[model samples]
Target: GASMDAIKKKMQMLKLDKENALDRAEQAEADKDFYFGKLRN
Candidate 1:
């Protein structure tokens, strides 16, 4: 039972990390688009 609980906690942490990465990637894409627009102007 203890091991199962620990495994669940690790899985939760992994999910959080994935969410953070996706957020960062989206932000990066937006930043790229903004900078590219400036150059095209």
Candidate 2:
């Protein structure tokens, strides 16, 4: 798992802002999974 800091940094490297901003949103989907797992426990 990655921290928001790590995720954002990765996103910066993978910037497709001119191509697809939606791809950036996908990074949060991973965080969502990590977050929901916390709730399940």
Candidate 3:
């Protein structure tokens, strides 16, 4: 799991526009689902 500070730093470093940053954040969350699903196997 990523910490909020790390995520914020990545967003800032990438210079992702606000909308894109939000999308990336959302994608990160979705990725968690995939990771957890794999753990169940």
Candidate 4:
């Protein structure tokens, strides 16, 4: 149920500066702290 555009938007918002999709994925993985910090509910 994921949209590519939405995912790309989220990646942009996260400020990931990777060159390719795989690099972006790695950046996302590295950003787990930011994601988990936002989930404190």
Candidate 5:
């Protein structure tokens, strides 16, 4: 039972990390596109 709880916590941590990574990637992509568009003008 104790081991299962530990595994659950690790899974939650991994999910949070995944969310953060995705968020950063999306933000970076958008920023790049915005700058590229401005440069074209």
Candidate 6:
């Protein structure tokens, strides 16, 4: 099994990755809306 410190470090990395993914998702949403507006008449 992994050590306690190592497990905590892994959790921290996971949280950081989650935040990064969320940021990307927000950017993707903005891009989608921007393109949609351009498509409209």
Best by TM-score: 1
Stronger candidate by TM-score (1 vs 3) = 1
lDDT of 1 by residue, 1-41 (tens): 99999999999999999999999999999999999999899
For residues 1-41, could you state the per-residue lDDT of candidate 3 as single tens digits?
47988998997877767778899999999999999999988
Ranking by TM-score: 1, 6, 5, 3, 2, 4
> What's model 4's overall lDDT?
0.76
* Residue-wise C-alpha lDDT for candidate 5, range 1-41, written one tens digit per residue: 99999999999999999999999999999999999999999
TM-score of each: 0.94, 0.43, 0.49, 0.32, 0.88, 0.89
**What local lDDT does model 6 show for residue 20?**
100
Between candidates 3 and 5, the one scoring higher on lDDT is 5
Error of 2 at 37 (Å): 0.5
lDDT of 2 by residue, 1-41 (tens): 46988999878877756346676567788889999999899
lDDT of 4 by residue, 1-41 (tens): 36988988988966654456678788898798678888874
Show how many residue pairs clash in every candidate, following the order shown: 0, 0, 0, 0, 0, 0
All models: lDDT?
0.99, 0.78, 0.88, 0.76, 0.99, 0.95
> Which residue pairs show backbone clashes in model 3?
none
Q: Which ten residues in a row have the lowest lDDT in candidate 3?
A: 11-20
TM-score of 1: 0.94
Number of the candidate with higher TM-score, 1 or 2:
1
Residue 30 in model 1: shift from native, Å? 0.4
